[PDB]
DNA sequence: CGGCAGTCGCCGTCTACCTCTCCAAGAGCAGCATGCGC
DNA sequence: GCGCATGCTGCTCTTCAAAGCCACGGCGACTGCCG
RNA sequence: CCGAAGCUUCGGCUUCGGCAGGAGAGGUA
């Protein structure tokens, strides 16, 4: 397996982060087994296929209010029902304010349930709709998710072979008159960092 | 301390009726100690005569 | 219930084993960890006749180990004489990454 | 530091010629590349 | 966004010569070797 | 007399754990922090 | 490279034998 060397890795400063545009850390971390980076990212596919991948998303998101609706509907029947063959009958209705209390906060139960997953796919389009190439992505479980649902168009890995590929994928030429651009006209810390 | 490390980790995996004193005890560690210091040390010095 | 890897030292597989299996009770937690399985295959050779079955450890240095997780069962299950650390653990290893269903179901298939 | 190298080399090799699952292969590449590092410049990260 | 000041890591700190001591240990795996049984 | 099982000795690894102990000046990035 | 032993035509030839790294403490100018 490829390795890096630690000469131009730990140094001051990081000649490797210099040549990648890449924070130190975050170099100790993907180098390390500790973080993903995305290598490339297939634009055109991205492109000829969003209308569709939004079909499909709308599908899910109907679904998943029908599952609410559906169990919301059967929860308020045993409610309803239960509690209306035994309010209380003869004193107050103590256990009706105790499970009144209890079912509003069923509802809302399953209320953030469907909010927390209406959350997890917001998220996850909104990451395949921002991917640009040398960005740090954490958290395993939504790396997974976005290589098992559009696992194609992206690709990406850790370790010291993704580094090979962003390093291979590279062009001198453009980001050399990128910075003398920034150098000709431009002021403050920028210049200091394009210096 | 290194042997009581030892016997508090040795305590737990061996079978009872069968625990004596004798069988918990390491003595190795100590001599290695005592052994260490009065050679490789800087405080104990060879004499000058 | 998940299994999980744990990295012993270099042939210390079977006395990590049996130390776990006896720390199970011993410590004082019988319902935490369930089943510990070393991996192992065979090896054909043959002395003229006479077999050896090397113990050919598919995966020399690891011991899957099927367990829950609290704030107990992870110091039994990691000052155990012999075991190294929670392999999996991306990221200040707070909190070991679980073995993935297919791959587990295929190696306890052997 | 050589022998550390090439000990580490050879069980990776095993390993993945193998059919080893992700995490594994992962810890031992993560390990072999510390080796690397400490033949290179030991110190310069982590403990010596 | 935009300055900003503490902070944290890495670099360096004279030359030549003499004498002595100390520098992995515990655990585990075969390769036969032999006693005993039918 | 032959076949089974279990014990002498070379001989070759093996090393993640974790508490321990706590100048001085110069230089340069950097990094959370306040506005 | 040195030693021992043979051939030696006196240029030499042959046999055998043989090694030297780190850490700490004290001192003299």
Redesign the interface.
């Given at each position: 397996?490829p390795?890096?060397?630690?000469?131009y890795f730990?140094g001051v400063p990081s000649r490797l982060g210099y040549l990648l545009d890449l924070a130190p850390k975050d170099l100790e971390k993907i180098?390390?087994?500790a973080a993903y980076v995305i290598t490339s990212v297939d634009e055109e596919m991205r492109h000829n296929e969003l209308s569709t991948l939004e079909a499909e998303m709308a599908v899910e998101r109907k679904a998943v209010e029908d599952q609410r609706d559906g169990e919301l509907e059967a929860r308020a029947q045993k409610l309803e029902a239960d509690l209306a063959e035994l309010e209380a009958e003869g004193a107050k209705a103590d256990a009706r304010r105790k499970v009144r209390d209890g079912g509003e906060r069923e509802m809302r139960q399953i209320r953030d349930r469907a909010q927390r997953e209406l959350d997890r796919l917001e998220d996850i389009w909104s990451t395949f709709t921002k991917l640009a190439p040398k960005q740090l992505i954490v958290d395993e479980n939504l790396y997974r998710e976005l290589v098992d649902r559009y696992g194609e168009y992206f690709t990406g890995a850790?370790?010291?072979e993704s580094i090979q590929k962003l390093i291979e994928n590279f062009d001198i030429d453009a980001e050399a008159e990128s910075l003398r651009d920034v150098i000709r006209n431009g002021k403050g810390q920028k210049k200091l960092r394009a210096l | 301390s290194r042997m009581e490390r030892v016997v508090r980790e040795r305590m737990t995996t061996q079978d009872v009726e069968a625990i004596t004193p004798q069988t918990l005890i390491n003595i190795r560690p100590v001599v290695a100690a005592i052994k260490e210091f009065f050679g490789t040390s800087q405080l104990s010095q060879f004499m000058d005569q | 219930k998940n299994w999980y890897?744990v990295?012993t030292y270099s042939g210390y597989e079977n006395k990590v084993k049996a130390n776990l299996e006896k720390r199970v009770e011993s410590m004082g937690m019988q319902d935490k960890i369930f089943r510990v399985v070393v991996p192992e295959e065979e090896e054909t050779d043959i002395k003229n006749g006479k077999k050896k079955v090397v113990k050919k450890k598919?995966?020399?240095?690891?011991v899957l180990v099927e367990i829950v997780m609290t704030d107990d069962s992870w110091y039994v299950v990691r000052n155990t004489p012999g075991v190294t650390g929670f392999?999996?653990s991306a990221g200040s290893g707070s909190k070991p990454?679980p073995?993935?269903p297919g791959?587990a179901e295929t190696?306890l298939k052997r | 530091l050589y022998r550390r190298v090439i000990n580490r080399n050879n069980?990776?090799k095993r390993?993945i010629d193998?059919g080893?699952?992700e995490?594994?292969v992962?810890?031992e590449?993560?390990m072999?590349?510390?080796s690397?590092?400490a033949l290179?410049?030991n110190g310069?990260?982590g403990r010596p």
């Open positions: 397996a390795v890096t060397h630690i000469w730990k180098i390390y087994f850790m370790g010291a | - | 890897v990295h598919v995966f020399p240095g690891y392999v999996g990454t073995l993935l791959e190696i | 069980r990776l390993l193998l080893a699952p995490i594994i992962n810890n590449k993560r072999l590349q510390e690397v590092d290179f410049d310069r990260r």
